[model samples]
Target: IKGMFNPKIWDKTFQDGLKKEIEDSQPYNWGTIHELVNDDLLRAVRKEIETEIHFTKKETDIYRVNQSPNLFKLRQILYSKQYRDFFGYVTKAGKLSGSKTDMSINTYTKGCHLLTHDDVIGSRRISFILYLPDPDRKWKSHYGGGLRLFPSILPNVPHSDPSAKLVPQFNQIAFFKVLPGFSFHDVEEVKVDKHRLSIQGWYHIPQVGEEGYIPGEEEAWVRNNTSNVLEDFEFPKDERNILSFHEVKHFEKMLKSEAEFTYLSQYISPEHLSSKGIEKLQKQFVENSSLQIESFLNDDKSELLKKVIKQKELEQECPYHSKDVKAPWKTAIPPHKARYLYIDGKEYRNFQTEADILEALNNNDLPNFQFTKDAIKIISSRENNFDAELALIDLAVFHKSTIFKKYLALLTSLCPVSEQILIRRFRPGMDFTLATKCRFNELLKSNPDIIDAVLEGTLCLTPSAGWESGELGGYELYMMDDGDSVLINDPPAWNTFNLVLRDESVLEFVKYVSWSAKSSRWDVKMKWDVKSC
Candidate 1:
C-alpha cells in the first residue's frame, strides 16, 4: 500500500520526540511508533496469516510460540530501507543497512512466552515487532502479551526482574538497538485466551556484496553471542557456599553403624527400602552416581498424595502473583532465569525488594517439616480441598526428615545433609525453566573434605496420561557439565524418587511444561552439601 506509515512520523518534530524518548528509556534504549502502517495492508496481512500460513507449535528452553514467516508485505515494511532508516535515526543506531533481513510472524496465544535473552546473535543491529492483534478491537494490558526489557546488573548480567514493559496495540511497532549483554527482553506469556499476532523482525549489518559490508564482522558477532554469562552469573560458583566437615559429620551421625530399614520405613515405601532394595540401590549409586527408586512412598501415602495433587491440579487456578500466594508459599521472581511455583520453608517472599531478600537471608530458619504435616491433615478433611503447596510441602518434609537423611547416607556414602528442600510446581503452558547448571549454596565452600557435588533428589508427582513420549514435556534432563549427551532424562512420573550426585559440571533443566499437559509437573526437589566418608 502507498505511504504505509502515518505521514506525521516523517515530520522533524515527531522524529525528534521519538529519538529523545529512545535515548531516555530505562533498561534499554527502545522506541515505539503507533499506527506505523496503513490499515488496509495490515488487515490483509492478518488475513493472509490466518488463512495462508500454517503455524506450528515450536517449544524450546527459551520460548514457546506458533510462528511462521510465509508472508511478503510485513517483511517489506519490516526490512525496507525506508523503515530501516527511520528506526536507525530514532534509536541513534546509525547507518540503516539494506542487507540481512530476518523476520517471522508469531502468534502468542495462551501459554505462549519467551524467556529473557539478548538478541545479540550474528551482526544483528536491531530487533523490532509490529503488532497486528485483532485490529478491530483494543488489546488490553491484562491480556498478557507484552514486550518486557530487563536492566543489566553487570555488563552481561541482567537483573532478574523486568523494569520496562511495552503493551502493543494494533499497527503499533516497537524496536530496540541490539546491544550485546545489555539488550535483554522477553515476551510475557499470553495469560488469557487471546491471540497476540505480531511481525517480529530484525535488521542486521550488511551482508557480503551489500553496502557497508565489513569482513569478519558477521563471524565475530556470532562468536560473541556464544560468549556465555550463565556460568559466572547464574550458577553459584563460589567456594564459600560449600558445607563444612562438622556439618557433614552431624548428618553422618544419624546413619550410625548399619542400614536402618526400620527408620527408613517410616517415610519411604517398605517395598523400595527393604534390606534387599537398599542393597540394590546402594550398588546402583556406587556405580552410576544416581539411583531412581520406583514406588518411593508406601501405597497408603502414595494414594493420598496422588489424589490430593491431582485434585488440586484440576480444580484450583494457580496463584501467579506474590500477594495471592499464602504464607509458607512464595512466587519466584527475576523471571529471566527460572519462573515456577516453589516452597522454600520460609515465610512468604517476593524477592521484590532488598528488605524482602535480606529478611529471608538473615532469618536462619531451618526446615519446618512439622508444619507440612499439620497442613496435610488440614487439607485432607475438606471436600474438593486440594492445596498443591501443602501437598508438596508434605512431600518435602518426607525428604527432610532425619530418617530420610539416614537413608540418603546409606545410599550415597555421604552424610549430615546440610539440606535445601523445595516443593516445585511447573504449571502447564505457563511455567518452565531454561537449562542451567546447579549452583551450590554460598555458605558451605570451605571444608577441605567436602565433595564437589551436591547430593540431589527429585520426587516427581505429575499426574499425566500421555507424557512419556515427551510430547507434553515436563521432563528433568541432566547432562554432563560440558557435553550434549544427556546423563539422565527423568519424565514426570508418579511416586518415583531419583537421587543423583551432581557435581558442578552437571547442567540440568526442566523442559518447559506444555499447556497440553493434563496437569502441572509437581515434585519435591532436594539438595545436600555432603562429605566423603
Candidate 2:
C-alpha cells in the first residue's frame, strides 16, 4: 500500500494495469477522495488568509476566483503525495496524462458565480475542489459557495443546467473526471460574503518514469484537441499535404499501382519541347537541378511565362532572406492548371526535325525539368495537395524520385507546361558550369526563333553555391536582404535527376550550393550560382 506511488513498482503488473486503463481510457475522467489533510495543510491555509493575501469582494454572476497560483509547503505535499490516484484516473480517461491540475482559493462575495468551463487546456484531464472554509464552525449550506456539475451533449456545448452540486466542510474535497462533451459544470452564487479554500490537483497520464510512457502523447492529446483541424485545414489550397504522414504513405502505394503510365510515346517522336526549349531546360538543369523552368521557354510558351512572371512580380517573400528571390510565385489569371503533362495547343511534340534532337542533345547539359505554373495550378486545383506533390516532383526537378513518380501522371492532369531537359554526367575532372545571365539573355532576346525571352525570369532560383560559384554564372540570383545569407546546398533532391518545390516559399530557403555529382570529386565545389530575376 505504501508503494502505490513508488517509482520502483513501475513495471509491476498493477502499474501496467493502471497504465493500460489510463492509456486507452476514454469517456469522462474520474478521481477519488483519498487524502483528508491534517494540521500542516490547515495551518498553511490559515496563514495565507492571515498574511499577504488580499481577498477582494468583487461580485460576479455566480462565483469568483483567486487567479494567483497558491504557493505553500502544503501544495508541495499535495503535489508529491496526497492524491496520485485521482490525478492518474482523470489523466487516463481524458488523455490528459501530462498536465498539472493547479489549486485555487475562491472568496465568493454576494451574487458571485462562475460560468461553465472545460479546463481542458494543456494536459488536464480531471478537476477537484478541496475545502478549508470555516474549519471549526460548520459553514452552513445557506452561505452557498458550492460545487455544481453538468452533463454535456458535445465536448463544447453544455446542457442548460447542472446535474449535481455539493457544499463542504474543512477537510472535505469534491472532485470529478473532466468530460470533454458530457461533463459540464459551474459554481453556485455565494448568497453571503464567504471564503472557500481548496487544494486541487490531477493525476498525470505519464511522464519520464512510467514503463510504457510515450514521447508526446500528452502534448499530442492537447494538440489533437486544438490542432488536428488546424493542421488539416491550414492550407486548403495546398498541394503538399498528400506527401505528409499517412497521406504520403497511402499515395505511394497508389503510385506503385499506377506504374503502367510510364510508357514512352513510341509512335510520337519527342516533339513537345521546341529544339530551343529543350536546349534551355537542359542548360538550366546542368547548372543546378533546382532551377525553375519558367524562364527557359520557346517564343510562344515564353509569352505565357512572361505573363505569369509579371503577375507574380510584386509577391512578398519570407522574412528570412535567400539568394533567388522569395516564395508565393504569384501566377497570372492562368493559374497552374494541369499535372504530369501540358500539351501546347500548337506543336504537340517537337520531334519533327533532327534539329530538335540536336537541341535536346545539347540541352542534356542542364540537369532537370519542371511543371510550369500552368501545370501545378491545375492539378492542385482538382486534387489539392496530392496532385500538387506529383506535379512538383514531375515538373520541378531534374533528378526524379524513382519511388514516387510512376503514379504521378495518373494523379495529375495531362496538361504540359514543362520543358524536359536531358542530363549527362561529365568525366570526374570536368565539373559543369553555365552562364545564367548570358544564357538567359540569349534565350530571351537573341534567339532568332524565340523573341523577347517572353517568360524572362520568374525568380531564377538556384542555391547559393549553385548561383554564385559560376556553376550558373549566366543568371543572377536576387536576395531579399544583402546579408549574403542563403540556406540550401543540396536542396531536397528527389531522385537521380529530380528536385521538387511545393511553392515559391520553399524556393526562397536556399542559401548555398554544391558541385554536381556528374563531375569528378576533385572538381567538386561547395559553391553555386543559382539565379532568380
Candidate 3:
C-alpha cells in the first residue's frame, strides 16, 4: 500500500521544499504535486471508480456535478498515518484525525462547475483534490475544470476575481490549508466533452481522545467560519433601504388620484392599465397572491427595448470575467451567494471592510437611474457601448417613480415604503443566485404598519430561444423555504413581468445559465417594503 504512493513524497528534502512552496503561495497557502500516486495504481483506481461507483447528477445554486463516493483503497491511502503525517508537514496543517473520514468522488463533465466559496465548514483543517483524468491524454486549460483561488480584500471579503488557477492533470493533487475567508476557491466550469474525475476530501482537526485535540479549538473554528456571522460583511448585501417620508407621502397621495392609467400608459401596456384589464389582474392576484403578465410593456416601448437589447446581445461582448466588467456595472461578490453583473444606480464601490459596508448602509442612496440614462445617451452617440444600457436605465428609473409605485399599490393594495431596483445580466456560464429566503431590513421588520413580506417583481427581458425547456438554465424559481415543493418555475422570456409577494418562508433564485445559452438573461429586478394602504 505504501509503495502505491510516489516514494518521492516521503523524502525529507522534498517535504521541506514543498512546505516552503506552500508557505510562499498566494492568494493563500496552497500547493500541488504531479503524479502523487504511482501511475499504474492511479490508473487502476480510476478504473474502479468508473466501474464501481454509481455517480448521480446533483445540481444546486452553487454547483452542478456528478458525484458518488466510498472508495476503499483511495480512502485508506489518503487517511493513512504515513500520508497524514506527510501532508501535515508539507501543509503546516498540524495533526489530522484518522478516525474522521470525509471524501467524495465527483466528475465535472461539460457545463458543470462549483462556484466560489471558502471551504471552512466544521473542523476541516485542510482540503485536497486528487485528479483522475485519463492518464493517456492531457487536460488542456481551455477544457476548464480548473481549481481557481481568490484573494481577500479583507478578512471576510474575497475579491470578485480569482488571482490564481491550477489546471490539473492525471494523478496530481492540489491542496490548501483551509483558512476561513482567505482560502476562497472554486472549480471552473468544464467546457469540453471530457470527464474530469476527482476525489475531494478534507483533513479535520484531531477528534476527541486523539493526540492534538484541543477542547475548544473546533468550537472556535466553527464559530468563526459560520456564514451567518460573515454575511454582514458581504458586499452588495441583500437589503433594501426605506424610502424617504417625502416620497412615501407623495406616492400615497398619487394612489388616491384619478387618471392613474394616463400616467402608467407610457410604460405599461394600455391593455393592462384598462379598467377591464386591471379588474382581471386584480382578481388573479387576490386568488393566488401572484401574477405573471406577458407583454406587460406598451407595444412601442417594448419594441424599442427589444431592438436595443437584441442589438447588444448580438453586437457587444458580454464580460464573463470579473476584471473585464466595467462600471456602472458591478459584479456580485462572494460567489456562493450570487454571481451576476448588476447596475444598482449607486456610485461604484469596492467594499473591503465593515466600514465600507457601514458607509453604504448609513448613506443609503436611492436609485437615480435617470443620471445613468443621461450618461448612457451621451456615450452611445460616440460609440456602441451603450446599446441596451440607456433603455434599461430608463426602465429602472420608471419603476422607481412615484406614479409607478402608485400603480403597483393599485394592483397589490399594498403601499410601498421602500424600494431597491437592480438591472441585472446573467451571462452564460457565469451567473446565478442561490436559493435564499427574502431578507428584510431590520428597521422595517419591527414596524407593525409594514407587511411581513417583500413585494418582488422581475421583468425578464431575455430574447433568446430554447429556454422553454429550462435545460439552458437561467429560470427564476420560487419554492417553500422548508420543503422541496416548487411553487413556481418561470423560464426566462421577453417583455414578461412576474410579481411575487414573498414571505420569509419562500426561497427564490435564478438558476445558473449554461454556456450553451444563446444569450445572457437580462432583467430588471425590484423589491419593496410594503404596508397596508
Candidate 4:
C-alpha cells in the first residue's frame, strides 16, 4: 500500500503533461489516468471490497447504487499527499484538503446508474472515480457503465445531450474539477450482466486549520457563487395555457345547459357517463377536485389496445439509446430533471440548445396524435401496434373536439381545452420523472381565469399483469402542496383514466420505473386550461 501510485505520477514530466491534457479536454476540464495505481494493491482492495463490504441499494432521482463503506488501502492512497499534489496540480483545482477525505465503494451492476447533476455540494473541489470492474479483463462500452459529461449552454443551463464519455478499464481513474453548472455528469446504466466496481470520492477545499485554509473563503463561495437555485432551475417555471375566444364561446353555452350523455357515449365508456356514475364522480370532484375512472375505455377498444400493448411489450425492443430512437419517439433532456421516451406529436425535441426550447415555445402546436398514430401503425406492422396510441389519440382528439369540449363544459363546468398531450413511455431500467410541480407557459399569466389551476388527465395504457404488484414503480402520485397528503395515486394499469383539476399549489411526479418491471409504464398525459362557465 505504501508505494500504491505509479512512480511516473510523481515525475515532473508526467505531471506537466497530465496538466496540459486536462486543460485541453472538452465539455469540461476532466482527465483520465490509466494504470494509476499499483496493480497488486488495487486487486487486493477490490477483493477486500467484495469480501468484507456490505452493499446497500440506494435509489433517488439522480442515482441508483449498491454502495459500501470506504476501504482502508483505497482511502489511504487517494487521500495521501502523493495523490493530492498530483490531483491539484493537474486539474489546477487548487490545494485539496487532506483532512476532508470522503469516499465510497459502489458496484454498478445491470440497471444501476447515476443521472445528471453537478457535484457541487459542501466544499468539494474535485470529484473522481477509480475503476475496479475486473482485474483480468477490459470493461467494454456496450457494458454501459461509462461516465458521460455534459456541456453548459449558459451558466446554470446545460445542454441536454452529453458531449463526452469515458469508458473505464480496470485500474483507470477519471476525474474533474467540480465546477457548478459546468461539471454535469452521470454514470450510464450498466446494460450487461457484469458489475462495475469503483471507488468514487471527492477532494474538498482546505478545511479549518489546514495549511491553505482561508477564513470565509469557502463560506463566501458557497453563498455568493455556487448554486442554491439548482432544484428550482431544473424545471420550467410556468404551467398555465390560455384559451382562445372561439373556445371560450363553447363554454358559455354549457353553463346555460348540459350536453347529451349519448354524445359522450361515443368516446367515454357508458359506466363513467351514466346517471349514477356522474353523480358519484361529481360528488368526488366537488370534494376532492379529482376523479379516477377504472374502466374508462369501452370493452372492444380496451381489448384491442391491451392486445397491441402486450404484443409490443413482449416482442419488440424499446429503444433506450438516443441514436436508435425515431420520430414520434424522443428522449427527455437534462437527466437531472427528467429522462424518459415520449411522443410529442409536433416535432422532435431534446433541449440540446437554447434554440430547442425556443422552437417548442414558438409554435402553438396542436395535439397531433396522428403522428403517434402513424408511428404506431409502423411499429405494429413491424411484424407494428398500439391501437393504444390510436385509441389514446382518439381520446385526446375527443378532448380537443369542439363538441367534446362542450361535454367537458357539461362535466366540471369548465371549458376551452387549451391542450398539451404527450404519449410517454417509461422504459424499464432507464426512465423516470423526478418530483416537480407542473409549470405553465408564461403567456398564460395574462388571464386570471386560467390562473388558479390547470385541468390534467392521464390515460394509463400499461398492460395489467406486471403493474398491479406496485413493485416496478410506475405509479403517479398527486399531493396537496401544504399538507403533503396524497390526493391521487395511480399505478400503471390498463384502460384507466384519471382527471385532476390541479391548482398551482399541487406537486406531481411519476416514480422511476425499475428494470425488473415486466414492461414499460406507458400512458397518455393531457393538460389544459379552462374557464368556469
Candidate 5:
C-alpha cells in the first residue's frame, strides 16, 4: 500500500465530474465511481491478505475468510447508516427490493461464474463494487470474470452485445443505479485460479420517511420491467440458465472437451461399465440395481446353478446383523465417517432359511467349491456334523458356474456406487472377524454365507489407508504367515493393501481353511464397499 497510488483521489474535479455523470445518467442514474481510498493503505491490506488468508474451495466458488471479526467490522461500517442511505437511495418498490443491505468479500476461481440477472431489489436504487487483487503480483489483463455492464434495449432485454466492460484495478469502486430492467450484469467464468477479491454492495430507500424519488417509482419500475425468466426454468431450475443461447454454447464447449473419466466419475467405475458394457449397465442401473439371473443366462447351466442364483437373489442386502454393528448402515463412528458403503446377501440349507457362513460351509461341497480350504471348523461329537457351510463356500469360489460368475460380476459392478472397488483377501495369515472390524463392511468382503458350505478362500477389501480404512483409522494388527505358527493373534494385518476387485470377490473371505492341524474349514465375515454410480 505504501506505493499503491499517487494519493490524490481527493481532487474535487473527479468527484464532481462523477456526480454530474450520476445526475444525467441515462438508462440508469449512478456515477459514483471512486478511486483508491488511501492507495498505500489499501496496498498494505492486499499484501497482508495475499500472504496469510486461507481461501476456501467449494465445488465452484473459492471464498476467502468469511469469519474474520475485524474484516466483518470494517464491512459493517461500509454498509451501515449513512453509507446505506447513499447507496440504496430508493425511488419505488423494486423487483427484488428489500430495505436491508448485504455486503461480502468474494473470490471467483476457474470456471466459477454467475449467470445474468437484473439486480433490482424492491424499492432498491444502486449497486456498487470495490475491487481488490494482488498488487505486487500485478493484476494482469485477460484473467476474466470482470464486472460487465449491459445497456438495456428494453427493461429485461439487454442488447445482445454488452455496451461496456471494466477490467477493474485494485481499490477502484464502480457504482451504478439499480435500473429496474437495465442494470444487467454477470461475473464471467474466471479462466484461471486466482484471487478475484471484491466487495459488492446495494443501497436501498430509507425504511422510514424517504424523499423526492416517487413513492411507487421503484416499485412500478420493478413490476413493469421485470421479465418472466422465473417461468423459463423449472422449480429449483438449472441455475446456469443455459436456455439463453450464450449459456448453451458454454456447456457445449465443456462437454466437447471433458474426458471419458469425467462421465465415469459421475457414475460407477470405468472398469464396471467397460467390462459389462456401458449400454447394458445403464439400462440395468436405470431400472433396478440387481443382478438378475435372466439378465445374463443364454441358457441355464444346471439345477445347482438355478438353486444358487435363486438363493442369492432372495437374500437382502444386509443378511445378518452383527453384535459389533451398532448401526448396520454405518460403522465408522461419528468422528470417523464411513467413506464407503457396504451391502451383502445370504444363503441357507434345508431349503428353509439362509444360514450364515458356518452353516453353508458345513453343508456345501468340499474342494470344488473354493479357492482356499481354510475356514471355521465347528467340531462336535458327530464326525460329519457341519458340512453344509463347506459346500456353500465351495460353490461360491470354484463353482465356475457361468451364471454364478456373472452374478458376482453384476454384484461387483453394482457395488461401485461413488468410490472405487476395494478387492480384499484376509489372506491365509490374516483373517477378518466381525468382533474387531466393521461387521457391515465384513459382510460385503465376501458372501461367506453363500460359500460357507465349501469352506473356500476368496478376497478382502484392502483399500489404501486413505480409502475405506480412512475412517476408523486402522490400528496395527498381528498376523501369521503360511508355515509360521499361528503367529501372534491380535487384529488383522497385511503386507500390502489393494482396492481393485469387484465386491462379489470378497464374499468368499477364505476359500478353504484348515481350521485345526488336520480338519479343514472356510472363514466367513466377508465384506466390500458399495461405491456409488
Candidate 6:
C-alpha cells in the first residue's frame, strides 16, 4: 500500500496538527482531510465503483440513497493497520480491529438525504465517509450534499438545527469518534441532478487477542448505547389518553339526538352523513378495514381552508430553524425518528433536558385545541400576522368534539375511549415520520373492553400541485411490521381523509418530502384507543 495514500498524511507534524483539529472540534470531536488519498487512485476507485457496482435504490424513514455492496482495493486500504493506527491517533478512538472490516458505498442523487442520527450502534469505534464527487470541480454548497453536524441539547437529545456543515470535495474524508449522544450528523438532501458518491464505513472495537481489547468493554459499550435512550425523550410521543366518562356519555347522548346532523354538517359533507352514504362506507370499511374519503370537508369549509393554506404557502415565511419556530408550533426532536412542525394543543414546551421531558410526561395534558383556536384569533386580531394557524386549529377542535367521536363510532362501530389530535406540517425537504408500529396506551391495555388496535385518521389539507405520482414523496405508507408487503400508500392530497385501524402488526410512516416539492404537506393527524361498546 506504499504511495497509495498522500505522503503528507504520514508526516509527524501533519498528524499532530490533525489530532489537534479533531480534539478542538465543535458539537463533537470530528475531523476531515482533503486529498488524504492519492487523487489518481481515488479517481480509479470511483471509476471502478461506477463500472462494476450495481446500485439499488434503498429508502427508509431515515434516508434515501442508492447503495451497493462491492468494494475491494479501497476497503483494503481504509482498513489497513497503518491507516487504523493513524486514524486512531487523530480521533483518540484508541485501538480498532483490523479483522472486522465493514464498508458500504452509495450514490446520492437529487432529492436524496440522511436524517440526523448518532453513530452509536454496536461496537463501532469510529465512523467515516469518503467523498467522490466530480474530481475536477468543487462541490458547491447550493447543490446541497453537505454533511451536517447537530449539537446536543442534553445527552441523547439532539437539537433541531444543525450547527455546522461541511461541503465536501473529491477525496475528502470526514471522520468522527462514534459517540453515544454527541456525534449526531446527517447528509443534506442533494438538490441538483449531480451524483454525490461516497464510501461510508465503521471501525470496530479491537477484536479478541488484538491490541487494546478489554474483557467486557464491548459488551458494556453496547449496553449503554442501544438507541432506545433517545426514544424516552421523543416529543409528541405515540400516546393517547383516555377520554372522561362524562365526555363519552355526552357523545352517546349526542348520537341519538335529531340535532346530530346539523352539528356534523358544519365540518363533514352532508353526503357522508346521509344514511345511504354511511351504509356504503361501513360496508367497504368492514370488508377492507380501511377507508379513503375524498372531498371530505363541506364545500365552504374546503374553499376557506384551501384559500388560507395557499395564502400561507405563498405570502408567509416559514421558519426552518427550530429556534425560530414559535409558540403553537414546535419542531420534532432528535430528527432520527421524525422531524416536522406540529401543534399538540398543550402549552408550548422547549424540551432541553430529561427534566423537561419528565415534566411534560407527568403533566399528561390532553389536547385542548379550543384554547389554541381562541388564542390564535386574539393574537391575529391584534398583530395581523396570522395565516393558516387559526383555520387549522379550528379544524382540530372540530375533530376533537364529542359529535365527531360519535360519527367515528357510527362508521367504525368501535367506541373511542381515548384520543390524540395533532396539526402537522411536513415541509418540503425537511420533514417525515419513520415507520413505527402502533403504540397502544399501556394504561388502557389491561382493560378487557379496550381493543388491541389504534384507529388512525389523517385529514390532508395540502394545497400543493404536482404530487400525483408521489415522486416528490410526503406519502403515508403502511405495511406489515413483520413482513414486507405494503398495505397502503396514500399520497398527500387536498381534502382527503384516510382512516386505518392499525394493529400491532402494522407499521406506518410519512416518507420524506423532497426539496423539489411545490409546498408543504399539511394535515391533521388523529389517533384513538377503541373499545367494543
Q: Tens digits of per-residue lDDT for model 6 on 1-533? A: 55479899999899999999999999889999998787888888898888888988877778889987224667888888889999999989889998898988899999888888997788899999899999989899999989999888777678778889999999899989988778999989999999888988999999899887888888888886444655667888788877889767665554445697899999999889999989988998898888999999999899989988888887777888876777888788767678899998888876655677678878867667888778777764313235578878888888888878988988988788889999899999788888889888877788897889999999999888888667788999999854368898888999999999999989999988988999999999999988775
Between candidates 1 and 6, which one is better according to lDDT?
A: 6
The TM-score that candidate 4 achieves is 0.81
lDDT of the candidates, in the order given: 0.72, 0.36, 0.84, 0.74, 0.36, 0.85
Per-candidate TM-score against the hidden true structure: 0.73, 0.34, 0.92, 0.81, 0.37, 0.94
lDDT of 4 by residue, 1-533 (tens): 35558888888998899999999999888999998888878888888878988888776545667886336766877888877877898999878898989987889887677877888887788998889989888778888888988888766666656789989999899999988878988877777888788888899889899967888988887786634444433422224344567777757865752455666776678887778887787787777677788988778677777787787777777776655666656777656677777766555555556666666667535446666566666664444434445655666666556676666656676775476767788988667776666666557667776656778889888884666534466788777654247776677888788889887777777877766777888888878776666
Query: Ten consecutive residues with minimal summed lDDT in candidate 5?
Result: 330-339
Mark the 10 consecutive residues where model 1 has the least summed lDDT.
234-243
User: Tens digit of lDDT per residue, candidate 2, span 1-533?
Assistant: 22223333343564455455444433333322323555455656666764766765432211235533235655654555323543443345423333243666655554444545565556655566666676667878777766666544333434334455667777675556555555555565555656665555554555665533678876787777742322211111111111223433443355342332223221111332345544654465445434443323234433333333223222322111111211212110000110011111111122223344345335432222343434444543223322322323332342133222322222221111112221111111111221111122322234343222111112222211223333321222222232243323332211212223212222222211122222111100011111121
Better of 3 and 4 by TM-score: 3
lDDT of 5 by residue, 90-147 (tens): 3222322233566555666654445345676665556777788765566656877666
What TM-score should be assigned to candidate 6? 0.94
Model 6 spans > 4 angstroms off: 69-71, 223-232, 250-256, 352-366, 381-385
C-alpha-based local distance difference test score of model 1 = 0.72
Top model number, TM-score: 6
- Once superposed on the true structure, which residue ranges of model 2 sit more than 4 Å away at CA? 1-35, 56-63, 69-71, 85-101, 202-205, 208-212, 227-533
Candidate 6, which ten residues in sequence have the lowest lDDT sum?
Answer: 378-387
Q: Cα deviation of 408 in candidate 6 (Å)?
A: 1.1
**Ranking by TM-score, best first?**
6, 3, 4, 1, 5, 2
Ranking by lDDT: 6, 3, 4, 1, 5, 2
Tens digits of per-residue lDDT for model 3 on 355-419?
A: 66678768866557877777667653324457677778878888987778878888887789988
- Model 1, runs deviating above 4 Å: 1-8, 11-29, 34-59, 65-82, 92-112, 118-125, 131-172, 178-184, 188-199, 204-260, 314-317, 358-394, 440-449, 464-469, 481-484
| Greater-lDDT candidate between 2 and 4 | 4
Which whole-number lDDT from 0 to 100 does residue 197 have in model 5?
Answer: 77
**What does the lDDT read for residue 260 in candidate 4?**
53
Scored against the true structure, residue 479 in model 5 reaches a CA lDDT of 24
Question: Which pairs of residues have clashing backbones in candidate 3?
Answer: none
